[PDB]
Amino acid sequence: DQYSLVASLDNVRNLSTILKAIHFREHATCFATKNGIKVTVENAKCVQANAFIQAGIFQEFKVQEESVTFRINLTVLLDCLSIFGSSPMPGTLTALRMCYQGYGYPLMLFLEEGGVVTVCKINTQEPEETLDFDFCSTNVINKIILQSEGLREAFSELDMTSEVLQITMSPDKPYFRLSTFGNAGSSHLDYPKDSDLMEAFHCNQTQVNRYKISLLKPSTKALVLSCKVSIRTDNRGFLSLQYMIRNEDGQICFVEYYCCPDEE
Template sequence: MAFLSQSQSDDDPYTFTCSLDNVRNLSNILKAIHFKDHAACFATTNGLKVTVENAKCLQANAFIQAGIFQEFNIQEESVIFRINLTVLLDCLTIFGASAVPATPTALKMCYRGYGHPLTLFLEEGGVVTVCKIHTQEPEETLDFDFCSTNVVNKIILQSEGLKEAFSELDMTSEFLQITMSPAKPYFRLSTFGNAGSAHLDYPKDSDLIEAFHCTETQTNRYKISLLKPSTKALALSCKVSIRTDNRGFLSLQYMVRNEDGQICFVEYYCCPDEEVQDAES
């Protein structure tokens, strides 16, 4: 890290800088939301939030708290820019995406502000690579207006339970139907694919369920094509919080433990399928 610590002189007016001893702690979490090329980056004193959206129906957020970084400095209340996430990940893994933790790649990331590129200094084994990535005008991100006061059902379960469900259910189905209820079936996942209907039920006292707070029976359908990107986050996670609000909007919050044992979060918001609801009503 010697070069990285010297890579910024006192005269450089960076509005945002951060550094990591192990770049995989950032690249792995960003891969979990990489289903579109572009992302919006928001830096505040709390840390870094990276947002990816699709078709105004799906939003994914990766939260990397400031404490994860060895250095995290921000000179303004908030710094916002849009970036090509595919290019950013290519740069972060420029030394290879080896899973061997013996030689971690160190990272220093610097941003001067609006109109300037995002500069990455990557160092591994004394070799330093400098990457400059063009930033773009930030676009307004969707506001799903998903607030905890409107949440009617919430279940926290070990990720293994959901991984098992996705492997057993028929993914040729167009929809995943989720039922959450204070009474039986409590928590049910259903698909309607080429091989017919499939249902997977979890009793509320299941060993996989860590918390069960359901106040009313809700059944909503969500396009599997929208939910599939979230399986990247599921694969990395140890726990997942599944919440629905009074409109049937779905929040999947994944707790991810990085290689240093620190906790990050990835959250997916998904709209219910309106056509199905209209047809049923």
């Protein structure tokens, strides 16, 4: 029609999950370019969480002016695109969404499953543009892909305390180290190269950094059901850029946790 943005899907679950996989703060900024939608979660000034879905995944995507941007209840939005479904089947879930000038953001969803089809009509509103927060793309030092499986398994010990990453120096065989520091309990996870399928290591100089684990927490938990890249900067700071390779029915999906503190 005449609108900031319009997007139909045939399978809501592609936006649903990747969206779901950055949902910790109450709201989010979803700047929509003519290329897709990137929605971003900004914690307490040390943690960005990005989430870029490209338009080629939306079965129909259209955008009038290069600015489409806004805030919305991330919680109450995600609640809507799963209005009815913790349990699907061969039956599917569809999303269509229509935004403009600065008043209303509605969503259109139907579900079909063995007898009747069900349209549900949502309209979630838009607050402020808030304080834009932009991190780092300066230089990388060591880069490291790991596996979907093994590294979620490792997160098994719930420590709630502190984080340190490590990346070793040798002619052939490096090492990559996790470590927590809580009430009587230092605990260390480290993965050697054997069986790296897409699990590639670029340890090039020796390096060990520190993270408050209170911020990165939602990241691993909520997002790493899939495999990531660990990249520690040393150009404008020393900081963690986990960006996880997620995907539904075979597509270029990605979200992105930059994180950067020392201690506290």
